[PDB]
Structure formats: C-alpha cells, structure tokens
Structure 1
C-alpha cells in the first residue's frame, strides 16, 4: 500500500487506461493535476495533457 512516485497505467493490449474523466483532478487536495482532453483520431476519449506538479503534491 506504500505511496510512491506516480505512474499512468495501461491495459494488457497497450491501450491507456485513462479516459480523461478528471475525477483525480477534481479530488486532488493540492490542485497538483492538470488535465486537457479531446476526442482522439479514432474517436476515443483520451487526454492531451496530464501534468502532476510533484512539488505541489502531498502524496
């Protein structure tokens, strides 16, 4: 359960798990997450910007 450096994960096919719902951005107590999204070339819901300020983050 140890909380360390952040990472973004994938499905076993290599597709990104993130679908740009922005719940992490909304809940973040430090406002450390910045997300921008648009439909991808194939129409998928994916992020164009996913930034975490690790000097703002409280882990």
Structure 2
C-alpha cells in the first residue's frame, strides 16, 4: 500500500519457472533495500502455469485477469521490469480484489 515494491529479488519464481521464462538481476538499492535491477518475463517462453505466483512469498508476481494483449510484433512480448510494474499499477484494483476472493483457498 505504501508504494514500495513487494518483490525482494529472492528468485524463487525464477527457480520454479518450468519454462525458464524469468530472468532476474538484483543488488542493494541506493538505500539498503534488496531489490531487482532486472526482472524480465519472456511471454513467448511462458506457459502461463502460475507456478511463479505460487512460489512468490510476498505476492509480488501475479498472473492477472487480462487476456487481451496480443501484439503486432514478437519483441512486444518480452516484458522487462518497467512493463511489469506498469501492469501492476494498471491492474492492481482488479488484482487485489481477485486475490481477496481466493487467498483463503491458498
């Protein structure tokens, strides 16, 4: 809620990803925080299996409800950290409500 990233660069999502679709680099931020400098998802490697959001200990990476994001070029499906943070800012209102409905089954 404060606007801080949930992701702590633990790399559990990267380890479990069946498709090796996640690439992560991290270092200490300008303050002492443990944060990513690279967070990529190759959406053309991803199998949309959801293991990454299961593996995440802080609910940082989620699969949202959007399924209407087909593109005209391949490169537009290679998401870097800026694109994914924008997705979270774009979809948080729906995402938080969906997690609210399902987190007691998890």
For the aligned pair, the TM-score class normalised by the smaller chain equals: 0.7 to 0.9
So what's the TM-score if we normalise by structure 2? 0.45
Shift in Å, 1:25: 0.0
Q: Which has the larger radius of gyration?
A: 2
Total equivalences in the alignment: 48
SS class of match (2:6)? coil
Aligned residue in 2 for 1:17: 6
SS class of match (1:24)? helix
2:29 to 40, 48, 51: 40
Structure 1 segments (4+ residues) deviating >3 Å: none
Shift in Å, 1:23: 0.1
Pick the structure with more helix per residue: 2
1:50 aligns to 2:50 (yes or no): no
Shift in Å, 1:46: 0.1
SS class of match (2:27)? strand
Aligned residue in 2 for 1:29: 18
Unaligned runs of 5+ in 2: 49-106
Shift in Å, 1:16: 0.1
Pick the structure with more strand per residue: 1
